[PDB]
Write a protein that binds this ligand. Structure first.
Ligand SMILES: *[C@@H]1O[C@H](CO)[C@@H](O)[C@H](O)[C@H]1NC(C)=O
Lengths: 386, 198, 208
């Protein structure tokens, strides 16, 4: 349930997409699968992503709803059903302000819970109303969503267990999400005025809030943050009573919200209603939501040359997404020299990650991979046999 | 910035017919809600119907809303009027839809439900007494328009009420020094009925 | 069907009870004065015990706080004449986007110069006229009440009735109520509930 209280009016640090092309399942020729392009870490949000088969754009392409990470950068998954063959080559083609030319990436065949809402408003000068996209998660599972460009102009279901909600639910969420929208639209105007930015340019406001319950299902922690142009603007502190503002502009907002009791209102929502509806959702979707899938792990070894090789430690089909992969070398931790890819969605509700290091020939046995995940009875330590 | 105006102060319509109550509002917000409430003489404020800015015209039983977002007109129509529909009707404008939101009301418009249109019935006229107070009682008349004159200290406005037969009864009281001989005459439907006639 | 009221002298204080029961967080208080638009005076955040006033309102005039169960309480200080009105509490519903109002409470403040003395019902009963009884076999007896304070009054009748509107005889009020009745030998009682009686009045009617 979206908040019905606590929401009140108040460069672009550009960042390049990271791009992963992979299959949902281990690829076997002639067996149906999904091809995924996960693009993450980018700002701003205007991005063009196409999937190519033998150089040609695949026409039937779906994508996830726009969401973003703790540093405010965005991520999207593009995916399509496909059946691999020996001859056909697949790729993903991406374009973004931060890229001088479209990047083609080739396919290479070889305890606690939270409810969170993400909100993005993108001004499109000369192109109409600002784009607004709202998504709701329980842990790492999207269940609702609003997109101002879609046909319904309603809050929409994205999980089977929310589909059973009543019409009072969908009307009410549509009301409150549209209230968030209009708040953000006023903020885009006001904020742009204050910084004397030109009316021609596109800007982003982002908002994220939510609540954690522990294993007793009682309130554990709450959060609420606000960014302008991918930069921290104002954030509720962990005590949910006071504000941190970086900009000078954000200090006028801080006084406004202190005088209007915004943090008290948010606290009432985050400690009560948020937790109650989190509990309802956890129960209604318990078979899907209250599971953990331990990571299925293995190590690969690719010879760079005669004097070194890449050891890649894989964790596949896990849930929830939180995971730690560490490499040590003779018990010394190798974080600085470890290639670490973003955790990425398989497309079926599980997640994927790997971590590689480059090892001189014949010293593989000195390197240990370490895997930590809630679905693991004890942390795993991998080593290469020979 | 936000305002609600109900131009009509009172409205009268007969039973079984329909009445329309206009309302004009002013809001800067893109999506909002309009509500129509009913206020009883016992003071209950009863919710009747809600209309969204981006929704189609609302219909809920005997209530309907003719919404015109361009003109910002949200008129409520009450069909098949019942006598118990007599109340003060308020148009209220929501804001964004937060639990902290107030409603901006208009002043109300009183609706009085009249008995059905029927053939005209000439009344009987009586005088009632207690010392100096003399009351003229007018029984079973239609239409409502009547002028009751006691021909002669003080005089009060007459009371006209709906009769159990669907017509009207009326009582006018006053105090007169020559009370013992004062009798009453009433002008109704172009005819004059004197208490002396009976 | 009955009106809840409270009558207090100016300079005094008045306490109104929100008769509204989800133990919801936010409750809004409205003033409705005759011929004006209901307006929100303040609202109460019951989770943080916070009173939030609208602009232009003294911080020392109104207050509100919870009590037994679902009864919230509203308090006014230094009463003046302007404070008379109907006070409502209301809360946005969880089920469906409706603001629910509880039955309002009418506050009458009494002006300073008020001779606060016999402001009880002042009855005067009227017996049927000759023509009525002779000519249609029925009789109207009219109970008239004057010189009572305040307008809140209720009148019944027994062995269905209509009445007039209470009107302002100087600074007290009057209301009359009549009947037409086989039951002409019998006698009827005019039963008046008024706060400054403290029991109901039972007025006897002759036989006709
Ligand atoms: C009734 O009103 C009409 C109005 O034109 C008038 O001509 C007529 O004489 C009136 N009736 C009587 C009895 O005077």
């Amino acid at each position: 349930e979206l908040a019905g209280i606590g929401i009140l009016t108040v460069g672009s640090i550009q960042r390049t997409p990271k791009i992963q092309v992979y299959s949902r399942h281990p690829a076997e020729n002639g067996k149906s699968n999904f091809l995924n392009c996960y693009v993450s870490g980018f700002h701003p949000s205007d991005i063009e992503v196409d999937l190519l088969k033998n150089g040609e754009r695949i026409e039937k392409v779906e994508h996830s709803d726009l969401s973003f990470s703790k540093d405010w950068s965005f991520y999207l998954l593009y995916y399509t059903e496909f059946t691999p063959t020996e001859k056909d080559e697949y790729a993903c083609r991406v374009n973004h302000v931060t890229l001088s030319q479209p990047k083609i990436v080739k396919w290479d065949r070889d305890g606690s819970h939270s409810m969170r809402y993400f909100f993005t408003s993108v001004s499109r000068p000369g192109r109409g109303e600002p784009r607004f996209i709202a998504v709701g998660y329980v842990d790492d599972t999207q269940f609702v969503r609003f997109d101002s460009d879609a046909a319904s102009q309603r809050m929409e279901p994205r999980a089977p267990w929310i589909e059973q909600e009543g019409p009072e639910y969908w009307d009410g969420e549509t009301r409150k999400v549209k209230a968030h929208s209009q708040t953000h639209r006023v903020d885009l105007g006001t904020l742009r005025g204050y910084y004397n930015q030109s009316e021609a340019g596109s800007h982003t406001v982002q908002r994220m809030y939510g609540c954690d319950v522990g294993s007793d299902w009682r309130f554990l922690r709450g959060y609420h943050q606000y960014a302008y142009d991918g930069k921290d603007y104002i954030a509720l502190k962990e005590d949910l009573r006071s504000w941190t503002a970086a900009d000078m502009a954000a200090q006028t907002t801080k006084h406004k919200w202190e005088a209007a009791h915004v943090a008290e209102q948010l606290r009432a929502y985050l400690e009560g209603t948020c937790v109650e509806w989190l509990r309802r959702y956890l129960e209604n979707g318990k078979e899907t939501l209250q599971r953990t899938d331990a990571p299925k792990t293995h190590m690969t070894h690719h010879a760079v040359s005669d004097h070194e090789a890449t050891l890649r430690c894989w964790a596949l089909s896990f849930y929830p997404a939180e995971i730690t992969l560490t490499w040590q070398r003779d018990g010394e931790d190798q974080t600085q020299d470890t290639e670490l890819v973003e955790t990425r969605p398989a497309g079926d509700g599980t997640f994927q990650k790997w971590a590689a290091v480059v090892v001189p020939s014949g010293q593989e046995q000195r390197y240990t991979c370490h895997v930590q995940h809630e679905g693991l009875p004890k942390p795993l330590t991998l080593r290469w046999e020979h | 910035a936000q305002k609600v105006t109900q131009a009509q102060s009172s409205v009268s319509m007969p039973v079984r017919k329909a009445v329309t109550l206009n309302c004009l509002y002013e809001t800067s917000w893109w999506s909002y809600y309009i509500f129509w409430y009913k206020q009883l003489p016992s003071k209950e404020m009863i919710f009747l119907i809600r209309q969204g800015s981006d929704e189609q015209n609302a219909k809920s039983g005997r209530y309907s809303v003719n919404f015109k977002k361009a003109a910002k007109s949200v008129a409520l129509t009450i069909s098949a009027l019942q006598l118990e529909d007599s109340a003060k009707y308020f148009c209220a404008l929501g804001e964004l839809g937060w639990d902290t939101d107030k409603l901006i009301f208009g002043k109300g418009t009183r609706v009085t439900v009249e008995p059905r249109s029927q053939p005209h019935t000439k009344p009987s006229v009586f005088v009632m007494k207690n010392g100096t107070n003399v009351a003229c009682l007018v029984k079973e008349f239609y239409p409502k328009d009547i002028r009751i004159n006691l021909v002669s200290i003080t005089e009060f406005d007459p009371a006209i009420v709906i009769s159990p037969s669907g017509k009207y009864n009326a009582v006018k009281l006053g105090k007169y020094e020559d009370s013992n001989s004062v009798t009453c005459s009433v002008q109704h439907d172009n005819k004059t009925v004197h208490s002396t006639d009976f | 069907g009955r009106t809840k009221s409270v009558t207090r002298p100016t300079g005094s204080s008045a306490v109104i009870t929100c008769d509204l029961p989800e133990n919801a967080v936010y409750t809004h208080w409205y003033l409705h004065q005759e011929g004006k638009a209901p307006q929100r005076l303040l609202y109460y955040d019951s989770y943080n015990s916070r009173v939030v006033l609208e602009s232009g309102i003294s911080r020392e005039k109104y207050h509100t706080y919870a009590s037994t169960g679902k009864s919230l309480k509203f308090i006014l200080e230094n009463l003046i004449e302007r404070d008379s009105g109907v006070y409502y509490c209301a809360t946005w519903a969880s089920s469906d986007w409706i603001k629910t109002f509880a039955k309002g409470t009418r506050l009458i403040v009494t002006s300073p110069d008020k001779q606060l003395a016999d402001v009880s019902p002042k009855p005067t009963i009227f017996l049927p006229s000759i023509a009525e009884t002779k000519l249609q076999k029925a009789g109207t007896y009219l109970c008239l009440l004057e010189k009572f304070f305040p307008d809140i009054i209720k009148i019944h009748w027994q062995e269905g009735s209509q009445e007039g509107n209470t009107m302002k005889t100087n600074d007290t009020y009057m209301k009359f109520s009549w009947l037409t009745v086989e039951s002409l030998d019998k006698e009827h009682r005019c039963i008046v509930r008024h706060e400054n009686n403290g029991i109901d009045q039972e007025i006897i009617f002759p036989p006709i």
